[PDB]
Amino acid sequence: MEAIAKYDFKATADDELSFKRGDILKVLNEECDQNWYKAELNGKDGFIPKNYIEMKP
């Protein structure tokens, strides 16, 4: 699936990865959390918040 960064984001921990308002993310895993997504960016893979992005099937 596709993901779209809506706001700027700077990780908080090792299991999270950054982006900047506009990144096109690769939606890999998703443990049905209702607050986060596991996606690929910039040569890394990590958690990103749902309210900071928008999904696009």
């Binding site: 700027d8 908080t12 999270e16 607050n35 986060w36 918040p49 749902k50 900071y52």
Partner: peptide, 10 residues
């Protein structure tokens, strides 16, 4: 001003 981030780990 972006949203309040969610508490991780549910």
């Amino acid at each position: 001003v972006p949203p309040p981030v969610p508490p991780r780990r549910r």
